[PDB]
Amino acid sequence: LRSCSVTDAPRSLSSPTVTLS
Amino acid sequence: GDREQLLQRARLAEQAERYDDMASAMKAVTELNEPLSNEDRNLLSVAYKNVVGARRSSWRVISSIEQKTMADGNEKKLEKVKAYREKIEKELETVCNDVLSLLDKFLIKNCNDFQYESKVFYLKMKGDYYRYLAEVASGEKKNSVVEASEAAYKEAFEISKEQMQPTHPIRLGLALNFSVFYYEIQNAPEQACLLAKQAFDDAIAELDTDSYKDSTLIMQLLRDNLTLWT
Amino acid sequence: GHMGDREQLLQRARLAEQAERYDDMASAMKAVTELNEPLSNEDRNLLSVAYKNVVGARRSSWRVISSIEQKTMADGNEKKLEKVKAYREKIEKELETVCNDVLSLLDKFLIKNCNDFQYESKVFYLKMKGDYYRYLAEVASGEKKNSVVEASEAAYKEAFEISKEQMQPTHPIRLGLALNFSVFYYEIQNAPEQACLLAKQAFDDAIAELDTLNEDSYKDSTLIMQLLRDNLTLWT
């Protein structure tokens, strides 16, 4: 499904807070 | 009040991916009643496409949860899911109505009879945002915006066919979206397939023509949709 | 029942998460917290996920605009630099409101109601308190920066002392706290040696006990440990 339409146009890593959902 | 300062704010907001700020800035530029350059048209189109696109994606997620909740018979939860869907829906409609108001009062109105590129761009944009309204409407409310969407698309297509080459990216994008309108919105897959095939074949026949990358991607999208619609 | 404030707000937050509308999600979770009842592990996750995305969008926008403020300052365009700095300050004010909202929730409800035996909750909230003071320190200057820098370190320190005495080295909350606290030393305090010792010690303590973990706990612990490893590689 979902036909396509015309489109338009280092720091340190901290802990990710992953979701439980 | 200064037009250049608003355009800079639009460019700053885009870089920060703050598209509500970018849309608000370009809304004010349009309201100055001065014509939009090609870059100005791009900034306005990019800003509102991102703003409405976020609402459309959020609406689709909540709408599908609403249907699943409805099938499960959870009436109490369904009322809460529907309340959120309606809240998101009204934001989407306000965004579309803002764009349509800008088009009908400043952009399309101020186009001369010889400003064909702007007229095709704006009329296609009008069909798009009426189509986005049609995605979230049903019944007589849907038919109203559906008819308005088709009318804008067809006048744009007639102008583009007379004034634009088949490989013009604006004409190709218009044909792509107009075919999408026939398939998804008004359930005419044969009419959608016929239109997408017309524009793609017409573009190939004149493929011997600096803006190739912009034109090429839309052409792939036309084929990809044709493959999906078989 | 289902019409209660808590139930409706939690339902809104879960729907907002699905729609990737994190301002809605955070506002709903802020209202849940203000009910003055404890947060479950799921509710704690919803609140943390919501505000991480909200502040993270502002941080990303701030860094982009602040970077342009640097180039526009070096390039020397007063007519442009004045408006660029004005836009960043508007982003800062949004960012500071978000952080202050979080810290108010932690200070008035979340940390406040933790019983002394709720070590996991205290470590979680104290680490969060250090996190959002650190986000304030990322944009602050002058005497304002000093107070939030001290506040962030003090929250991190107390959390880490409790976590060391109450949590195994492989615990994701302890591992995430050590990671963020070492990031605080490197990025905020400009103390690379202190940052490297903390991260290295946390990685070494955890890796000594990975072999006892089950498949699911192993994935949760090693994912944070990889971030400690990637930080160590980048810091020298």
Residue numbers in the entry:
A (entry chain C): 338 to 346, 444 to 455
B (entry chain BA): 4 to 212, 216 to 236
C (entry chain AA): 1 to 236
What's the publication's text?
Neural precursor cell expressed developmentally down-regulated 4 ligase (Nedd4-2) is an E3 ubiquitin ligase that targets proteins for ubiquitination and endocytosis, thereby regulating numerous ion channels, membrane receptors and tumor suppressors. Nedd4-2 activity is regulated by autoinhibition, calcium binding, oxidative stress, substrate binding, phosphorylation and 14-3-3 protein binding. The interaction between the 14-3-3 protein and Nedd4-2 is mediated by phosphorylation of three residues bordering WW2 domain: pSer342, pThr367 and pSer448.
Because the 14-3-3 binding motifs pSer342 and pSer448 border the WW2 domain, we assessed whether this domain participates in 14-3-3 binding by crystallizing the Nedd4-2335–455 construct in a complex with 14-3-3ηΔC. The 14-3-3 ηΔC:Nedd4-2335–455 complex crystallized in the monoclinic space group C121, with one Nedd4-2 molecule bound to the 14-3-3ηΔC dimer in the asymmetric unit. Concurrently, our crystallographic analysis of the phosphorylated Nedd4-2335–455 bound to 14-3-3η confirmed the bidentate interaction with the 14-3-3 dimer through both 14-3-3 binding motifs, pSer342 and pSer448, also showing that the complex establishes more contacts than the structures of the isolated singly phosphorylated motifs. Furthermore, in a complex with 14-3-3, the WW4 domain of Nedd4-2 is located near the surface of the 14-3-3η dimer, whereas WW1 and WW2 are fully exposed to the solvent.
